[PDB]
Amino acid sequence: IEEASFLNGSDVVILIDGVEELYMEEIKADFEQDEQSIKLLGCQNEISRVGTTKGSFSLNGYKTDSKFAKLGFRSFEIIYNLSNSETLGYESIRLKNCRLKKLPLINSKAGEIVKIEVEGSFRGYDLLNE
Amino acid sequence: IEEASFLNGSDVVILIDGVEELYMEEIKADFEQDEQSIKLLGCQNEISRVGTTKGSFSLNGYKTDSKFAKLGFRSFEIIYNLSNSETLGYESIRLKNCRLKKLPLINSKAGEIVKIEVEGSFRGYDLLNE
Amino acid sequence: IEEASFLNGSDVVILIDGVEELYMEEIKADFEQDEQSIKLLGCQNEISRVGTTKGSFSLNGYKTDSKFAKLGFRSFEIIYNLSNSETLGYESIRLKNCRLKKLPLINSKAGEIVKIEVEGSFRGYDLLNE
Amino acid sequence: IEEASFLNGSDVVILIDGVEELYMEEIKADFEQDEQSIKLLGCQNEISRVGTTKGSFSLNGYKTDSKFAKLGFRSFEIIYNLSNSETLGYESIRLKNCRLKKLPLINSKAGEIVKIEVEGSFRGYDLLNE
Amino acid sequence: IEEASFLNGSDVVILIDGVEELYMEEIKADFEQDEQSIKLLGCQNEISRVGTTKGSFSLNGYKTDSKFAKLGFRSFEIIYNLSNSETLGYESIRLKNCRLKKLPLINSKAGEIVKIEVEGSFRGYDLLNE
Amino acid sequence: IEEASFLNGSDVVILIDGVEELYMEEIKADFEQDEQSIKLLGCQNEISRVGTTKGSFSLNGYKTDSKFAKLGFRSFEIIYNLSNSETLGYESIRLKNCRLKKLPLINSKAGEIVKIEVEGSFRGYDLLNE
Amino acid sequence: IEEASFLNGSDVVILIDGVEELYMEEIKADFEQDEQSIKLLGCQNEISRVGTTKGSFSLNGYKTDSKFAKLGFRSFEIIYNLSNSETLGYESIRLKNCRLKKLPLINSKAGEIVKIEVEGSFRGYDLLNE
Amino acid sequence: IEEASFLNGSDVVILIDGVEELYMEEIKADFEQDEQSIKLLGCQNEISRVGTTKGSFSLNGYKTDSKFAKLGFRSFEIIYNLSNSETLGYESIRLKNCRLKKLPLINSKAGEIVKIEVEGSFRGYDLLNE
Amino acid sequence: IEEASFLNGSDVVILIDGVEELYMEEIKADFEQDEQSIKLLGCQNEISRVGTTKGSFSLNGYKTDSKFAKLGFRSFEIIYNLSNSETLGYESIRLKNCRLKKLPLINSKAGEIVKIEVEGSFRGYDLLNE
Amino acid sequence: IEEASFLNGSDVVILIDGVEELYMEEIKADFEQDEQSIKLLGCQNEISRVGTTKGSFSLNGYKTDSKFAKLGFRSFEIIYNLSNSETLGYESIRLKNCRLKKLPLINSKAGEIVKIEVEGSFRGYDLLNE
Amino acid sequence: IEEASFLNGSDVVILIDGVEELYMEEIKADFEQDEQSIKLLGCQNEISRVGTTKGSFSLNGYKTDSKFAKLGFRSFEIIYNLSNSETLGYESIRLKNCRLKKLPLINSKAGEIVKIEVEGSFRGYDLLNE
Amino acid sequence: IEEASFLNGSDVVILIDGVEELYMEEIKADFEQDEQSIKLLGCQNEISRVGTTKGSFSLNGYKTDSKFAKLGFRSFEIIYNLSNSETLGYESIRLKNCRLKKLPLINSKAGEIVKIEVEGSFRGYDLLNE
């Protein structure tokens, strides 16, 4: 019903190691189970339990510097804020111990704008606001 | 033949842990066998038997809050009601011990509406109505 | 050459456990070998032999009831009749000991008609008519 | 250069067990190596040798009878003739000991013409003409 | 060369103490030498001679009764018939004084079909047919 | 032939010292001969005779208490019931004087569910039902 | 039935000589019989009796110090606590007079994290809690 | 910059076993490493070394004869010449010990021109011109 | 915000072994972890650590010479410069010990411009400028 | 270098007691030393001398008759010929006084082709051709 | 918890007889008890005591010289240093009187990098640093 | 560090009794101690001393002749040369008094290339070059 509840991608600000990142196209982050399946002798359905949690992120954008190449495989943090405009509420998520799986050293095509895409893993998250 | 028997997606109401969810785009739920294949010496076709049953659900929608991030990996229930309008009949399905496989912490694109997609597993189901 | 030999999907009637199913979109059924490959020392080509036979079916349609959810994983039969109109001939195939691999508990999208898709296995077949 | 050398699909006649098949859409047949790779200590490139040969065919068409369902998994032959019209030359290939991998018992969609698709294996081939 | 000479496991019927066993998965039987090695002073290769013969069988299947638990360690016979279908020939082997080495009292896993596996010894064999 | 004769692991209930055990994954029990081999001077095959009988069991499951650690090396009984559902028949086996070979004091891995596995010996068995 | 009864490896804390060990991957401990087999003249089954008890442990983890190399072959204790979260119950086991069979002086591979694995024996155990 | 440096597919002539092939649509040939990855204890990046070299080719065209069916799995050579027109330079590559992986016995569709596609392996190459 | 920060593919110059490459369509280079996953007994999330680093590049272009065929599998370097025009800044990346995984001997289609595509691995990188 | 020197398994013909065996999958034969180790007082390396020679063979194939069951433990001969096709040379080896260690009375699985595997010993060998 | 405590294999430097070894893949070293088991008349558990200590090492790497073949069976020392990078701490272990059990004279495969693997024994160890 | 130090299997040439062997896949040779363990009354660690040295080799390849069958159990020599290409250095090892443990008379499988594998012992070695 309420039009105002929907949140657009334009209400997004990303901070990589405390400095705002402006030239990003999309971002993803998931906190995934290693779900443990259990089968019992007296019971005829599988029982699922929570396993170890791992974080995975991807982060696609437009290249304007060699920030990620300098950044290397050092650990960093990602603070992601998604705000509402019609309402004043906002969500803020801090991904901790983020680390790149691979360095986007070179990615260019003949007549397109140079884009940068990275992926990696993070240990845990803090839901700062909501 | 009968036009009235068909059921549209618009006749759908979803309850996550007893509170209605309004900003959902699609939902899926399957109760899958671990079917056991049997081959016998005197017989020339495979015999299939029912194994342990597992439930899997997926649930795609539009982000309006951090409900699933707060929800974490705790167990919850999903009550799914699909009603007919031309007829007064309706189906109601309760998925029990539902648990998320991964947390949709961040999912945003440059100029699109922020969407949320989750998947998980459930133990069993109750066919409340039909 | 002969236009009349072709058979359209519209000349199809499906019986699930003896009661006609009217709201189906497509149906598939295959009877597959576990073909055994043989290599011999004196011979330079593989010899293939018939192994155990397994049946697999899929059955896509439009949801009008909770028939398959009630049906569960019980064994049922499928009688498939494909008739000719310009000619009076018809084929009838009976799939025996049919059993669902998974239950289509929930499948709905935002603005589409609710569809139901199931798959399973069957032991053998009877070619009743042809 | 020469327009006449090209061969169209329309110049095709297929014989299944000696009786012509008229309602076929496409046909495939390959005679595949189990190629053996050899690495030697003194040499820096792989040596390839001929292994056992296996035949595989596929055969898609339009359903007009239960020929393949009756045919079951019995061995049969396929004689494939591809003729030239502008020239009088023609090729004829006989696939021997052909055997179906699976039976196309049922394949129908809501408003489409009923099609039949089969696949299988054959032992060897005779290049009757060319 | 001849496809018909090969014998499939599906052409197998097993009789335990004169009553047919239908739920068996595989069977083995060997008649083993206690081969005697001889070394001679004037000769530079070992001479091998036939020693006492012992029979050993194994018999894996699916549990449908407590037949083997009741059977205990009593002596029984196994008649094994392997028939050809394309040809009318068949082999029949009678294992005599068969006796179980161990009783399969309990063998069950969480979500699998209950299987039974036994092993034992037999004195001699009669090649009834061939 | 008969689908109903097969018995699944889900139809299993285990009683350790008269109290039901619910969190078990698999169970095994064998009653093994100390088979005596006999060679005779006039005869050219080995004669096998029944020796002393020993029982061995293994019992794998999921840890929910320190039941087996408290149980120590005291003697206990195991009653194993395997029931049929499609048929009403059932088997019941009582293992007597069961005793653990080793105590599963500690068994845990980094991110897996804590499992418990025990093995032991039993004197004799009673086939209560069948 | 009860989801809460299962215990995950994540609810584990290990104390080596009173100081907590944080970088462990898995732990094992068994208290094994030297079971004595008895055969009697009038009786046709083996009688089993409890022999001397020995403890054996293994302890795999990630190397962060030379703790075990300094520890040498001195006697130490292991206190193992496995707690429940959904329930407040917990088990605590104290292994006494633990002693290493071998010292893990060096264990490293080319591109993997340095792991440490030890095994040893203990005299007895105290089941502190449960 | 220079328009003349580009080479079109039209400047291509292919020789199969010394006789020109005119009805080809595309050709591919690669000489692939079995690259050996090395990880060292003192070093934090992988070292790559050249392994055994294998050649793979594919060759798609239009069917005008049974050349490849007669050719079988015999070894043959492929000489590939790519010429420049605006410049007089040209490249010539000779693939040696070329051998088909599979025979394109039959490939025809309902109303399309009969095409032939083959793949195979070659030992080495000679860069005759450039 | 700033239009000038974006970098187009047209501001790219590539040097293969010190000589400029003009007829390239796109280039890629990544420096990938062999990320090591760690699970601990007391902790409920995976710990990720940096493993050995490997470089992978791909390099697609238009064929104007047999440079890569002559180059073979020898080691070479790639210097990649991406310059800004509105700003005077530029990035320069030197890939070291670059080596081809496969040689693009032949790649041509019927009526298209002859293209060349290569892939390979490199040991490390130097970020010369930025 | 020379492709023609390699010998495939397809160029194999086996004669058991003078009659060709066609349904064999693999064959092995070794002539093994009972090597005598010598240590001397003045010398610091072991001296090895030739002991008595024994032959061992294994012979795996597909069952088409009860040939080996009738053959029993009687002595027989094996003539093994391995021919070259590209060259006209061939090897022929005659194993003498071959005798089975065990009789393959029964070997069948649920849905697989019945295979026969035998092993035994032979006294000596004649290298008839080469 | 602490990411920095983990030690990677890349922080490893090995000295064989005082000269650094760079081309090693993995190393192992254990200092093993000849543990003495004691059983007493009044006591019902085994008593374990420390026996003589023996050292065993293994050392796998890549061959670049005949160092170990020249080294023969002479006694040598191994100094193993494992350093931390995020922290400045390091461990150093000196294995004394190391001696090879066997000489890796030849170890090569068809298309793989030549590797060298050795094993041996050492008398004692000095924990130089930690 | 240095790429050139690594030695590939392709830089290998083997001489059996002075004539080069070209069709070999891998080779092994070890010179093993009969290490003598010493325990002393006043000392708490084992003392290890060099015992008699024995050589063992294995040599796997592809069959192209009956060289090893003719060779029998006669003594022969193996000269193994492993060369560097980027550097001009090379290793040469001469194994003396090599003698086969068993003769590879027959080794063939259904559709694989005939391989030959031998093992044996040698007295001593000469490190000719390095």
Does the beta-carbon distance from I42 to G110 stay under 8 Å? no
Q: Which of J33, J129, J115, J9 is nearest to J79 (CA)?
A: J129
Among partner residues F22, F26, F110, which is closest to A42 by beta-carbon distance? F22
For D75, phi then psi, to 5°, come to -75, 140
Using DSSP's 3-state secondary structure scheme, residue G22 falls into: coil
Return d(Cα E108, Cα B7) in angstroms, integer. Answer: 45
Distance from CA of G10 to the nearest CA of A (A): 8
The answer to whether B81 touches A55, Cβ cutoff 8 Å, is no
Which residue in the block uniquely carries the two structure tokens 């050709």?
H27
Return d(Cα B23, Cα C68) in angstroms, integer. Answer: 28
Does the beta-carbon distance from J24 to C43 stay under 8 Å? no
The answer to whether H96 touches H77, Cβ cutoff 8 Å, is yes
Return d(Cα F55, Cα F98) in angstroms, integer. Answer: 9
Q: Chain H residues within 8 A (CB-CB) of chain L?
A: 36, 38, 43, 47, 49-52
Q: Which of G11, G15, G12 is nearest to G78 (CA)?
A: G15
Q: Which residue of E has its CA nearest to F124?
A: E105
User: For residue G34, what are its two tokens?
Assistant: 């030297």
Beta bridge partners of G19: G16
Q: Which of L58, L41, L38 is nearest to L122 (CA)?
A: L58
Q: Which of H62, H61, H16 is nearest to D82 (CA)?
A: H62
Does the beta-carbon distance from D26 to H109 stay under 8 Å? yes
The answer to whether A86 touches A3, Cβ cutoff 8 Å, is yes
Direct distance between the N- and C-terminal alpha carbons of chain F, in angstroms, rounded to an integer: 21
Return d(Cα G29, Cα B37) in angstroms, integer. Answer: 38
Direct distance between the N- and C-terminal alpha carbons of chain C, in angstroms, rounded to an integer: 21
Q: Where are the beta strands (DSSP E) in K34-89?
A: 36-38, 47-49, 53-62, 76-83
Return d(Cα J92, Cα J77) in angstroms, integer. Answer: 13
**Rg (chain K; Cα; Å):** 19
The answer to whether L28 touches K103, Cβ cutoff 8 Å, is no
Return d(Cα J44, Cα J39) in angstroms, integer. Answer: 8
Listed in sequence order, the residues at least 6 apart from H79 whose beta carbon sits closer than 8 Å to its beta carbon are: H14, H15, H18, H92, H93, H94, H95, H128
Measure CA L31 to chain center.
Answer: 9
Direct distance between the N- and C-terminal alpha carbons of chain K, in angstroms, rounded to an integer: 21
J-B interface (Cβ pairs under 8 Å ≥ 3): yes
Does the beta-carbon distance from G112 to K8 stay under 8 Å? yes
Distances (CA, A) of C105 to B95, B124, C118, K86: 9, 11, 10, 53
Listed in sequence order, the residues at least 6 apart from K25 whose beta carbon sits closer than 8 Å to its beta carbon are: G109, G110, H39, H40, H41, K60, K61, K62, K115
Return d(Cα H125, Cα H121) in angstroms, integer. Answer: 11
The DSSP bridge pattern shows strands H19-21 and J36-38 to be: unpaired
Distance from CA of I40 to the nearest CA of F (A): 5
Return d(Cα J120, Cα J29) in angstroms, integer. Answer: 9
Return d(Cα A102, Cα J60) in angstroms, integer. Answer: 51
Return d(Cα B20, Cα B17) in angstroms, integer. Answer: 8
For C123, phi then psi, to 5°, come to -80, -55
Distances (CA, A) of G40 to F98, G45, G47, G48, J61: 19, 8, 8, 11, 48
Distances (CA, A) of J93 to B40, D57, J80, J88, L62: 42, 40, 5, 17, 18
Three-class HEC string of chain I: CCHHHCCEHHHEEEEECCEEECCEEEEEEEEEECCEEECCCCCCECEEECCCEEEEEEEEEECCCCHHHHHCCCCEEEEEEEECCCCCCEEEEEEEEEEECEEEEEEEECCCECEEEEEEEECEEEEEEC
Helical (H) or strand (E) element with F69: helix F67-71
Listed in sequence order, the residues at least 6 apart from J58 whose beta carbon sits closer than 8 Å to its beta carbon are: J26, J27, J28, J117, J118, J119, J120
Q: Which of G8, A88, E126 is nearest to I45 (CA)?
A: G8
The answer to whether J97 touches J122, Cβ cutoff 8 Å, is yes
Q: Which of L113, C41, L66 is nearest to J92 (CA)?
A: L66
The answer to whether D18 touches D25, Cβ cutoff 8 Å, is no
Return d(Cα J85, Cα A129) in angstroms, integer. Answer: 78
Three-class HEC string of C59-127: EEEECCCCHHHHHCCCCEEEEEEEECCCCCCEEEEEEEEEEECEEEEEEEECCCECEEEEEEEECEEEE
Q: Which of I120, I115, J88 is nearest to H28 (CA)?
A: I115
Which residue in the block uniquely carries the two structure tokens 């040779």?
L29
Alpha helices in chain G (DSSP H): 67-71
The answer to whether I101 touches H32, Cβ cutoff 8 Å, is yes
Q: Chain I residues within 8 A (CB-CB) of chain F?
A: 39-41, 44, 46
Distances (CA, A) of F128 to F79, H83, L35: 9, 89, 60
Return d(Cα F39, Cα F45) in angstroms, integer. Answer: 7
Resolution (angstroms) equals 2.7
Listed in sequence order, the residues at least 6 apart from C85 whose beta carbon sits closer than 8 Å to its beta carbon are: C11
Q: What is the DSSP string of A42-89?
A: S-SB-EEE---EEEEEEEEEE-SSSHHHHHTT--EEEEEEEE-SSS--
Three-class HEC string of chain E: CCHHHCCEHHHEEEEECCEEECCEEEEEEEEEECCEEECCCCCCECEEECCCEEEEEEEEEECCCCHHHHHCCCCEEEEEEEECCCCCCEEEEEEEEEEECEEEEEEEECCCECEEEEEEEECEEEEEEC
Does the beta-carbon distance from G66 to K27 stay under 8 Å? no
Angle at A66 between CA A64 and CA A69, to 5 degrees: 145
Q: What is the DSSP string of H94-112?
A: EEEEEEESEEEEEEEESSS
Return d(Cα C65, Cα K112) in angstroms, integer. Answer: 63
Return d(Cα K8, Cα K85) in angstroms, integer. Answer: 9
Q: Which of C96, E126, H121, B4 is nearest to J70 (CA)?
A: E126
Which residue in the block uniquely carries the two structure tokens 């606001």?
A129
- Residue-wise over A33-47: b if at least 16 C-beta within 10 A, else e? bbbbebbbbbbbbbb
Distance from CA of B44 to the nearest CA of F (A): 10
Helical (H) or strand (E) element with K70: helix K67-71
Phi-psi region of L110 (alpha: psi -120 to 50; beta: other; left: phi over 0): alpha
Does the beta-carbon distance from H114 to D6 stay under 8 Å? yes
Return d(Cα E18, Cα F76) in angstroms, integer. Answer: 39
Number of Cβ within a 10 Å radius of residue H41: 26
Give the best residue of G12, G86, G113 to mutate against chain I (max I CB count within 10 A). Answer: G113
Using DSSP's 3-state secondary structure scheme, residue G5 falls into: helix
Angle at K110 between CA K104 and CA K116, to 5 degrees: 20
For H11, phi then psi, to 5°, come to -95, 35
Measure CA D84 to chain center.
Answer: 19
Return d(Cα B127, Cα C69) in angstroms, integer. Answer: 8
Look up residue J130 and give its DSSP letter: -
Beta bridge partners of B95: B78, B125
**Rg (chain I; Cα; Å):** 19
Look up residue B73 and give its DSSP letter: T
The DSSP bridge pattern shows strands E115-122 and E36-38 to be: unpaired
User: For residue J103, what are its two tokens?
Assistant: 């009789």
**Rg (chain E; Cα; Å):** 19
The answer to whether D57 touches D121, Cβ cutoff 8 Å, is yes
Return d(Cα G23, Cα I47) in angstroms, integer. Answer: 11
Q: C20 burial class (0-12, 13-18, 19+ CB within 10 angstroms)?
A: exposed
For K41, phi then psi, to 5°, come to -70, -40
The answer to whether K96 touches K77, Cβ cutoff 8 Å, is yes
Does the beta-carbon distance from E64 to F95 stay under 8 Å? no
For E47, phi then psi, to 5°, come to -105, 130
Q: Which residue of C has its CA nearest to J113?
A: C36
Helical (H) or strand (E) element with G83: strand G76-83
Does the beta-carbon distance from K113 to H49 stay under 8 Å? yes
Q: Which of F110, B105, K10 is nearest to A122 (CA)?
A: B105
Q: What is the DSSP string of D9-77?
A: GGGEEEEETTEEE-SEEEEEEEEEE-PEEE--SS-SB-EEE---EEEEEEEEEE-SSSHHHHHTT--EE
C–E: how many Cβ contacts below 8 A?
Answer: 11
Q: What is the DSSP string of H33-92?
A: E-PEEE--SS-SB-EEE---EEEEEEEEEE-SSSHHHHHTT--EEEEEEEE-SSS--EEE
Direct distance between the N- and C-terminal alpha carbons of chain I, in angstroms, rounded to an integer: 21
Q: Is the alpha carbon torsion for G88, G91, G92, G98 positive or negative? A: negative
Distance from CA of H29 to the nearest CA of I (A): 5
Q: Which residue of F has its CA nearest to I42?
A: F110
Does the beta-carbon distance from G1 to A43 stay under 8 Å? yes
Number of Cβ within a 10 Å radius of residue B53: 22
Angle at E125 between CA E123 and CA E130, to 5 degrees: 170
Q: Which of G123, G127, G118 is nearest to G80 (CA)?
A: G127
Measured between beta carbons, the chain C residues lying within 8 angstroms of E6 are 38, 47, 49
Which residue in the block uniquely carries the two structure tokens 């099609």?
D115
Which residue in the block uniquely carries the two structure tokens 């420049």?
H84
Listed in sequence order, the residues at least 6 apart from D107 whose beta carbon sits closer than 8 Å to its beta carbon are: C27, C28, C29, D63, D114, D115, D116, D117
User: For residue L54, what are its two tokens?
Assistant: 């024995």
Return d(Cα G12, Cα G83) in angstroms, integer. Answer: 7
Return d(Cα A5, Cα A17) in angstroms, integer. Answer: 30
Return d(Cα I85, Cα I105) in angstroms, integer. Answer: 37
Helical (H) or strand (E) element with K69: helix K67-71
Among partner residues D1, D35, D80, which is closest to H22 by beta-carbon distance? D1
For G71, phi then psi, to 5°, come to -60, -30
Measure CA J75 to chain center.
Answer: 14
